[PDB]
From a paper:
Using a pair of evolutionarily related DNA-binding proteins, each with a different DNA preference (ParB [Partitioning Protein B] and Noc [Nucleoid Occlusion Factor], which both play roles in bacterial chromosome maintenance), we show that specificity is encoded by a set of four residues at the protein-DNA interface. Like ParB, Noc has a three-domain architecture: an N-terminal domain for protein-protein interactions and for targeting Noc to the cell membrane, a central DNA-binding domain (DBD), and a C-terminal dimerization domain (Wu and Errington, 2004; Wu et al., 2009).
In the crystallographic asymmetric unit, two very similar ParB DBD monomers (root-mean-square deviation [RMSD] = 0.1 Å) bind in a 2-fold symmetric fashion to a full-size parS DNA duplex. This structure reveals several regions of each DBD that contact parS. First, the recognition helix α4 of the helix-turn-helix motif inserts into the major grooves of the palindromic parS site. Second, helices α6 and α8 contribute residues to the protein-DNA interface. Last, several lysine and arginine residues in the loop spanning residues 236–254 contact the minor groove side of parS in an adjacent complex in the crystal. We found that most of the crucial residues for binding to parS are within the 162–234 region, suggesting their importance in recognizing DNA specifically. First, R173 in ParB hydrogen bonds with parS guanine 1, but the shorter side chain of a corresponding Q158 in Noc is unable to bond with guanine 1. G201 from ParB has no side chain and hence cannot contact thymine −6 specifically.
Author numbering:
A (entry chain A): 125 to 237, 243 to 250
B (entry chain B): 125 to 264
DNA sequence: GATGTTTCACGTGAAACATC
DNA sequence: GATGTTTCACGTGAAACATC
């Protein structure tokens, strides 16, 4: 089987009519099956390693936030900015309610976020 | 003939694999033949009227600059920023040599205006000197 | 070396002017 | 009303950090 097949498939992920989350799952599945690094994918598609990483990180977002991405109520920039936040769904609602830019959203994330319990001695 | 045909063709200009100049000529040709305004195209493709105008304005650039756009040595932002300049080809060379951002390119364009079309038209010099004209020689 | 994450420079597209 | 042009806000993608 010709090696060029893998390269063409990876190349055409970004050239196809895929939303950001469809591109993410594509890269993840291809990295796994063809056993390729974030760095290898990046060099293949002519992008940065962090771009590949940040794209796939979006798959970890709660389904409510992913729904906003698909519907276009949030952009990829908004979603990524709240990805490592305590309550991304709360922040998502604030972004849509307030009409926040990605820059304003980054500011919100900076200025926002538990006891494991056990019998008291 | 169904009217929806024109709309689909206009819609798919931006969805096709066209460089900025191919998109420009498409819009121009379609505006002409279907007798539609910049405003009508804009509303059809879900963009601004100025976006449609600025896109087509790029067709007026010298062939040398258009070549840089096609080759990717310049972006649409660079090309548009020098479109109303006296010598766009000179500016194009400076942008590529210096690796100037579009913001830096806009700054260059401000401080080298096309308003240098105040060139002397010539003409036989009159018998009576014309004092004011003679005095504007030094300052110019 | 591989990957997680944040901050900001960039070109693109639009607002804010202009003329005719 | 239609169109020419300039300036700048925006999201995207990358640099500059981090851990393991």
């Amino acid at each position: 089987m010709l090696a060029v097949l893998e390269i063409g498939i990876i190349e055409n992920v970004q050239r196809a009519d895929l939303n950001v989350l469809e591109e993410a799952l594509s890269y993840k599945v291809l990295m796994e099956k063809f056993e390729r690094t974030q760095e290898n994918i990046a060099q293949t598609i002519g992008k940065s390693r962090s771009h590949v990483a940040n794209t796939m990180r979006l798959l970890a977002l709660p389904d409510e936030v992913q729904s906003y991405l698909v519907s276009g109520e949030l952009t990829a920039g908004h979603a990524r900015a709240i990805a490592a936040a305590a309550d991304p769904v709360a922040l998502a609602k604030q972004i849509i309610e307030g009409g926040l830019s990605v820059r304003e959203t980054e500011a919100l994330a900076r200025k926002a976020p538990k006891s494991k319990g056990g019998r008291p001695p």
